[PDB]
Subunit: 153 residues, 4 copies
């Protein structure tokens, strides 16, 4: 089923954010794309936009998220600090596919200063169209992540 | 100053783990390397080994960690669930460098089914020898990650 | 139509060559896979094996080639020295796809010390199943490569 | 010794070409940077610009070249068709380093639709500052490439 996508970014992606939104829409796999990054040419702090996208997902306003910074890495760290969210840094087709098949990730994290736009297109299209694999071992690992999060409190 | 490194992995890296430990030692940037992945040829669950390395760092038994799974992504997610830890998935020199310069990451997460061994060598050597940049904006972002983690509780 | 694949490599891929051949066979897109790299654990020179694969293609013993060295780069250079051959270094899905769509490459060049095995699987499967795009501009560029080669003599 | 660099590209890099030239200059490793790609916003054919850069090197107007297309791959193929030129497609630090250490490449080939700009910065700086390794085995392989080229005629 197509997905409701929340897209957040910092200023690193401000120049390209509409191009990225266009990819999401053109993928066929989104029923809605919501932009929650900066709407001005200002420097901003990626954790703040990570939090916007995480909270959209947690409140059921979006099903899936994409977070864009210079490398993806800050986005990945900040998003994973939210209880109930699994955020995957992906930089190619295989990481995009396995972040869904194995890690059943809610959020795709990408870098616009590291990945070119055609690679970002493939990553997005793969992430949005890949389902978590039915073999029980990957789900069991995901459940262990949940146990860690709960224990951390 | 050379660092005390905790290396954890799942079974994806079992075949290569001693080669990876050898890289860490040969880098010149480690005063000690401790292996905390599997010591048998069994299937295991990466979150369990992520937790070992996180807890080594948090207890001051290691200064820095390296976590290895098939892609790095599961390691990144699981490690970031620990309070006080920032875990960076890196797949090249620039991500290794910026994970330290900008995100001041405690843990390097890599994939042995995605990155070849010479790329892993460069990633490791860069991660272990790069310091966090003194411009205040990156530290401020890191502090925001801490605030998120604290709020999540 | 499935393809007849000649696989060549230097000693960098000797440990993994049968795993790579297995991927080619499992792709569904090969009617035959022929190994023309080293069948011993000796150091060898990649141009010699590049030439084997190039000559297989030129004589019609294979339709397509895969060349494996530490990075792919030496293979790419050496193969491209053959008249009538276009050899593409690929390291992800998008380069594999466009090396066929745009550059209509005969030979895939990969690095086993740079690309992990699951990325190599995706590269191979994509390269073998992607056809050259019908828009005339890419073919025209390919024809210009032919003119350069002919002029060089 | 700093190098005289010829930079060529097709229209894929037209938007970013001055940013790339700026990187080359800022690297410290160039005594001159000459742009030989398109100076208009028109569609063009990458082999034509590959040839410009190859001929600059062969005539001694430049010491080294950088060629930029959407992926690098077309540039790599076309440049390698010139007698006396070795052209390396690079997408990270390790490929940049080994393209010089091992393959003693004259031309760096990069993709602006595949590699982000910070990765391109690292690639360029590494390529321009890395010398060919003195162990005889890599030079001997390079000499074999020369023999192939001569035989092809």
């Amino acid at each position: 089923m197509p997905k409701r996508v929340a897209l957040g970014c910092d200023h690193a992606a401000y120049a390209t954010h509409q191009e990225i939104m266009d990819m999401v829409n053109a993928s066929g796999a989104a029923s809605k794309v919501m932009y929650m990054g900066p709407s001005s040419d200002t420097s901003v702090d990626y954790p703040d936009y990570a939090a916007q996208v995480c909270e959209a997902i947690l409140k059921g306003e979006a099903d899936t998220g994409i977070l864009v910074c210079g490398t993806g890495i800050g986005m990945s760290i900040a998003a994973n600090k939210f209880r109930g969210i699994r955020a995957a840094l992906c930089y190619d087709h295989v990481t995009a596919q396995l972040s869904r098949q194995h890690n059943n990730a809610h959020i795709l994290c990408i870098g616009v200063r590291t990945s070119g736009m055609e690679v970002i297109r493939d990553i997005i299209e793969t992430f949005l169209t890949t389902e978590p694999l039915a073999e029980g071992r990957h789900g069991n690992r995901v459940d262990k992540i949940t146990v860690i999060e709960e224990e951390q409190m």
